[PDB]
C-alpha cells in the first residue's frame, strides 16, 4: 500500500548490519560507508535498548556523501511501532507558534506510549432481530439472534441496546460486532466474511499514543482536532508537568509503557541560536528522544550572531553531541550505487555506458549522474531499443548542462545575465 512512485532513498531499506555489527560491502541497498554504518548501528541498538535517553549525536560530511541515507536506513531499520521524527531546520520557524514551543513539540512527538485495554465483544451474523413498541408490561421487549459457526444463541436486549439497534438501521443477514462495555455496534461486512467461532471473547486493545497526543487533548475541550489542524497554539507548561507525573504513575501501576523514539533534524546549520540554547536544556531532562543532527556546512557563521563558530554550531551544543564523520565516495563505489539505482528505476545500462556514467560521476558529482540515468531512458525510448546506449548518454550530457559548465558559461556571458548591481544589456549591437 501507501502509493509512492520513486524516492531518492526508495532503494535503501533498513541500512545493513550483521550480528557482529560489522557492515557488509553491499547490504540492503547500502553500499560504501563502513565506519559510519557501524556507528549508526551502535546508535540503533542503543535506541532498541532504551536504557539511555536524551543524548545527541552529530553526522558530519561533504554534500551528497553518506549523510541523509544514514538516518533513512536507521529509521527503516528501526521499523514500525517505534517513533521517528524528521523535521527540517526551517520548519520549526513559525509565525503562529514560537520557536521554543515548536521545538519542544517535536520532543513531545518523538516519545510514544502504549496503553492496553481489555474488552468483551460479541460478534456474529444476525439472522433474526425482533423489536417491539413500548407496552404497559415492560418498557421495550426485543430478541436478536446472533448466529456463529460454533455456537448460536439468542440474547434479550437491554433497552438502550434497542435504541442502538433502532438508532442505526440494521438489516438481517449482515455480520456485526457489538461492544458491551463501549455500547456501540461495529459492522464488519455482510453474509464477505464468515463466522469464526464463539460469540463472546475477551481481547486486549493496545493503543500507541505519543506524549504530544496526550498533551493536546487535556489542554483543549477537543484536542484531537488540534492535533490534525495544527492550531494547538502554545500549550501551557503546567499541563505538561501534570502529564509527566500521570505518566509516571501509569508506569508504576504497569498500565502503560514508553518507547524511546528517535528525533532526526535535517539542516541544523540554519537553526537559530535561541533554539540551540533551548536544546541544551531539553536534552538533560528525563523524557527526551535520542537526537541526531546533520550539517553539510562547516566553519561558518551561526545565525543570530556576528562571529563564526566552527561547523556552524555553538560549542555548548557540540559538547552535548557526539560527532560522526562521513567520507567522500571512491570510484568503485559510485558505479555500484548507480547500478543499484538502475535496478531500482527499471533502467538497463550497458557496461560501456556504465563506464562513462562512472567517469562523469567522479568528475562532477554522483547526484548528477543519478539524475541523468533517469533522463536517458526516454531518449532510449524514442529509439525503441530497450537498453540505454552510449550515444543516448552523450546526448543527455549535451542537452542538460552541469553546474560547473554552467558557471563557466555564465562567466563568459556575464554581460547578458543580470548582475548584483542590476546591470544588463538586452541590445545586441553598440
Amino acid at each position: 500500500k501507501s502509493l509512492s512512485l520513486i524516492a531518492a532513498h526508495s532503494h535503501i531499506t533498513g541500512l545493513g548490519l550483521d550480528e557482529n555489527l560489522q557492515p557488509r560491502p553491499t547490504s540492503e541497498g547500502m553500499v560504501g560507508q563502513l565506519q559510519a554504518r557501524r556507528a549508526a548501528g551502535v546508535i540503533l541498538k542503543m535506541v532498541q535498548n532504551g536504557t539511555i535517553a536524551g543524548r545527541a549525536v552529530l553526522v558530519a560530511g561533504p554534500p551528497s556523501t553518506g549523510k541523509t541515507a544514514l538516518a533513512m536506513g536507521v529509521s527503516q531499520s528501526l521499523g514500525k511501532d517505534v517513533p521517528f521524527t524528521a523535521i527540517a531546520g526551517s520548519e520549526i520557524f513559525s509565525l503562529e507558534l514560537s520557536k521554543t514551543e515548536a521545538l519542544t513539540q517535536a520532543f513531545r512527538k518523538s516519545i510514544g506510549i502504549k496503553i492496553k485495554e481489555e474488552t468483551e465483544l460479541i460478534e456474529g451474523e444476525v439472522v433474526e432481530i425482533q423489536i417491539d413498541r413500548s407496552i404497559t408490561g415492560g418498557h421495550k421487549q426485543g430478541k436478536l439472534t446472533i448466529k456463529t459457526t460454533d455456537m448460536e444463541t439468542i440474547y434479550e436486549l437491554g433497552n438502550k441496546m434497542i435504541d442502538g439497534l433502532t438508532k442505526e438501521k440494521v438489516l438481517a443477514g449482515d455480520v456485526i460486532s457489538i461492544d458491551k462495555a463501549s455500547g456501540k455496534i461495529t459492522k464488519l461486512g455482510r453474509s464477505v466474511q464468515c463466522p469464526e467461532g464463539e460469540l463472546q471473547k475477551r481481547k486486549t486493545v493496545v493503543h500507541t499514543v505519543s506524549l504530544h497526543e496526550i498533551d493536546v487533548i487535556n489542554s483543549r475541550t477537543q484536542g484531537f482536532l488540534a492535533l490534525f489542524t495544527g492550531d494547538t497554539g502554545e500549550i501551557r507548561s503546567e499541563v505538561r508537568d501534570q502529564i509527566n507525573t500521570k505518566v509516571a504513575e501509569w508506569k508504576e501501576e504497569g498500565k502503560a509503557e514508553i518507547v524511546p523514539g528517535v528525533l532526526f533534524i535535517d539542516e541544523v546549520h540554519m537553526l537559530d541560536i535561541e533554539c540551540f540554547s533551548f536544546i541544551n536544556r531539553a536534552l538533560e531532562d528525563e523524557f527526551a528522544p535520542i537526537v541526531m543532527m546533520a550539517t553539510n556546512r562547516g566553519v561558518s557563521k551561526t545565525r543570530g550572531t556576528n562571529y563564526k563558530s566552527p561547523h556552524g554550531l555553538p560549542l555548548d551544543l557540540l559538547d552535548r553531541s557526539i560527532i560522526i564523520t562521513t567520507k567522500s565516495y571512491n570510484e568503485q563505489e559510485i558505479k555500484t550505487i548507480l547500478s543499484i539505482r538502475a535496478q531500482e528505476e527499471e533502467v538497463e545500462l550497458s557496461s560501456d555506458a556504465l563506464d562513462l556514467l562512472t567517469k562523469t560521476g567522479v568528475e562532477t558529482s554522483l547526484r548528477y549522474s543519478s539524475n541523468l540515468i533517469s533522463v536517458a531512458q526516454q531518449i532510449a525510448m524514442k529509439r525503441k531499443n530497450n537498453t540505454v546506449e552510449v550515444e543516448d548518454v552523450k546526448r543527455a550530457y549535451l542537452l542538460f548542462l552541469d553546474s560547473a559548465r554552467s558557471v563557466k558559461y555564465v562567466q563568459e556571458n556575464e554581460s547578458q545575465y543580470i548582475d548584483d548591481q542590476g546591470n544588463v544589456q538586452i541590445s545586441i549591437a553598440k
Binding site: 500500500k1 501507501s2 502509493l3 509512492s4 512512485l5 520513486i6 524516492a7 531518492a8 532513498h9 526508495s10 554534500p63 551528497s64 541523509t68 527540517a88 531546520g89 526551517s90 520548519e91 520557524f93 513559525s94 509565525l95 503562529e96 492535533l227 490534525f228 489542524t229 495544527g230 492550531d231 535535517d266 539542516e267 540554519m270 553539510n296 557563521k301 528505476e345 527499471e346 547526484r367 548528477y368 539524475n371 533517469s374 533522463v375 526516454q378 531518449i379 524514442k382 542537452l399 542538460f400 548542462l401 552541469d402 553546474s403 554552467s406 558557471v407 556571458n413 556575464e414 547578458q416 545575465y417 543580470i418 548582475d419 548584483d420 544588463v424 538586452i426 541590445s427 545586441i428 549591437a429
Partner: protein, 434 residues
C-alpha cells in the same frame, strides 16, 4: 474580439514524433535545443516514474524562458494539473513561508475520482413533525411518473423549514450531502391567486429517485482542506462551525499521511487514479535561503511532484545570505539536484520573424519597409520594445485611415514613446531628478 497579452501565439513546443524540433512551429523560432530538452521533460512527466525531480532554465531577459515554460503546460494538456507560481508569493502574513511552499506540492498532484449520487425531486404533498431532540419529518414528494414518501433527518428538516417550503411546492433534495433546493411552487396552483410574487415551475419529469455517476476531478490539496476544516452547509451549526475559525491554519504531517493513506485505499478499489503535475516558480532569485534549504529536503520526498524553476541572473548573492555568492541566485547545495536548460539570444532574422508572427496573430498588416525598421529597432534597443510599439503604430494608422503600417508611422511612434536607453540619457542630464 480576442484578447492577446504577450501570449496565445504559442500553441505548444511543436516537436515531431522523433523528437526533432522544426525551425518554425507553433509560434516558435530558433531555440531548438531548449524545445528538445523540454519535450524530453514532457515525456518524463508522461512516464510518471520519476518524482521529486527539478529542472531549471537559466537565460537572459527576453530569451523566452517563461514563454517556453507555458508551452510545456500546453503540451501536457488540461487533464494534467499545472500550478503557475511566483517566488514573491511564498511570503504570506497569515501562514509561514514553509507551509505555503509545502502546500503547492500537494496542489500540483491531481487525483480524479468517480462517485454516484442519489437525487430526489417532486412536489410536496404532506409535511408532518414526528414531535429535547428535533424530531424527523415525513415528506410526501410527488413525482410526475409516481408517488413516493421518504423520512428525513432532523437537520435537513431544519434546512427545509428555513427555505419556507409549503404543501404543493416543488423542491430538490440531494441525498449524500443533504443539500436542499426549491425550484418553486407547482404549476397547478398558478390559478390560486391572480397576483403573486412566486414564480411557477412545471412538475419534474421522471421518477422521484434518480442516479448518475460523475468523473469529477479534485486536486489532492482540495481534498485535504475538506478533512482539515469544515465547509459550508445549509444548517446553522455548519455556518457557526466554519465561522469559528475562518483563518487558514498549518496542516500537520499526520493528517497529510492519513489522507494519503485513504487515497491509497481509494486507488485499490480502482475508483481513482493518481497523476502527477508540474510546479512552476517564476523569479526563483527572489526566494530566501530558508525556502531553498527546505526545498533541499522537500524534493527528496516521494510525493513531491516535478518542479520547474526559472531565474535570470549572473553570479549573485542569495537573498538572506551575507557572504554567500552562487550562480543564478540559488545555493550550491540545491543546484546539485537541479538540471539546467540553457537559453540563447535570438539573431536579427529571428527577431524579424518574431515580430512577423506576433503581427499576424495580433491581426495587423505591416509593410516590408516598416518591418525592416522594426527589426533594426529590435536590434538597437530591445526585443520587447519592437513588440511593444506594434499596437500604437496600428492606432496611428487608424487615425490616418491607412490599413497598413508605414515608415512614417513607426518613426512617429519612435518620437512619441521612448525606451529605457533614451530615458536614462535624459536622466543623466536633467535639472531636478526628471
Amino acid at each position: 474580439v480576442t484578447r492577446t497579452a504577450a501570449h496565445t501565439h504559442i500553441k505548444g513546443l511543436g516537436l515531431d514524433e522523433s523528437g526533432v524540433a522544426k525551425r518554425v512551429e507553433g509560434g516558435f523560432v530558433g531555440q531548438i535545443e531548449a524545445r528538445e530538452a523540454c519535450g524530453v521533460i514532457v515525456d518524463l512527466i508522461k512516464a510518471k516514474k520519476m518524482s521529486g525531480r527539478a529542472i531549471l532554465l537559466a537565460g537572459g531577459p527576453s530569451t523566452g524562458k517563461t514563454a517556453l515554460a507555458l508551452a510545456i503546460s500546453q503540451e501536457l494538456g488540461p487533464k494534467v494539473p499545472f500550478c503557475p507560481l511566483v517566488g514573491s508569493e511564498l511570503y504570506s502574513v497569515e501562514v509561514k513561508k514553509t507551509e505555503t511552499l509545502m502546500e503547492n506540492f500537494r496542489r500540483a498532484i491531481g487525483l480524479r475520482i468517480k462517485e454516484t449520487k442519489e437525487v430526489y425531486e417532486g412536489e410536496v404533498t404532506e409535511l408532518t413533525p414526528e414531535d429535547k431532540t428535533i424530531s424527523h419529518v415525513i415528506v410526501g414528494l410527488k413525482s410526475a411518473k409516481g408517488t413516493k414518501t421518504l423520512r428525513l433527518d432532523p437537520t435537513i428538516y431544519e434546512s427545509i423549514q428555513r427555505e419556507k417550503v409549503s404543501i404543493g411546492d416543488v423542491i430538490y433534495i440531494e441525498a449524500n450531502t443533504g443539500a436542499v433546493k426549491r425550484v418553486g411552487r407547482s404549476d397547478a396552483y398558478a390559478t390560486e391567486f391572480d397576483l403573486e410574487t412566486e414564480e411557477y415551475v412545471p412538475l419534474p419529469k421522471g421518477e422521484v429517485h434518480k442516479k448518475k455517476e460523475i468523473v469529477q476531478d479534485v486536486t489532492l490539496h482540495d481534498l485535504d482542506v475538506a478533512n482539515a476544516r469544515p465547509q459550508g452547509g445549509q444548517d446553522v451549526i455548519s455556518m457557526m462551525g466554519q465561522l469559528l475559525k475562518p483563518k487558514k491554519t498549518e496542516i500537520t504531517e499526520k493528517l497529510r499521511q492519513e489522507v494519503n493513506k485513504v487515497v491509497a485505499k481509494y486507488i485499490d478499489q480502482g475508483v481513482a487514479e493518481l497523476i502527477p503535475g508540474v510546479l512552476f516558480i517564476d523569479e526563483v532569485n527572489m526566494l530566501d535561503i530558508e525556502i531553498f534549504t527546505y526545498l533541499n529536503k522537500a524534493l527528496e520526498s516521494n510525493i513531491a511532484p516535478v518542479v520547474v524553476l526559472a531565474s535570470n541572473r549572473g553570479m549573485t548573492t542569495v537573498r538572506g545570505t551575507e557572504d554567500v555568492i552562487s550562480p543564478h541566485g540559488v545555493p550550491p547545495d540545491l543546484i546539485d539536484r537541479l538540471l539546467i536548460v540553457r537559453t540563447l539570444p535570438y539573431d536579427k532574422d529571428e527577431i524579424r520573424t518574431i515580430i512577423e508572427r506576433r503581427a499576424t496573430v495580433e491581426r495587423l498588416q505591416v509593410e516590408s519597409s516598416a518591418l525592416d525598421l522594426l527589426a533594426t529597432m529590435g536590434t538597437e534597443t530591445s526585443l520587447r520594445y519592437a513588440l511593444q510599439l506594434l499596437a500604437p503604430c496600428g492606432i496611428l494608422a487608424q487615425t490616418s485611415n491607412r490599413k497598413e503600417i508605414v515608415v512614417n508611422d513607426v518613426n512617429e511612434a519612435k518620437l512619441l514613446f521612448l525606451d529605457a536607453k533614451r530615458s536614462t540619457k535624459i536622466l543623466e542630464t536633467s535639472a531636478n531628478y526628471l
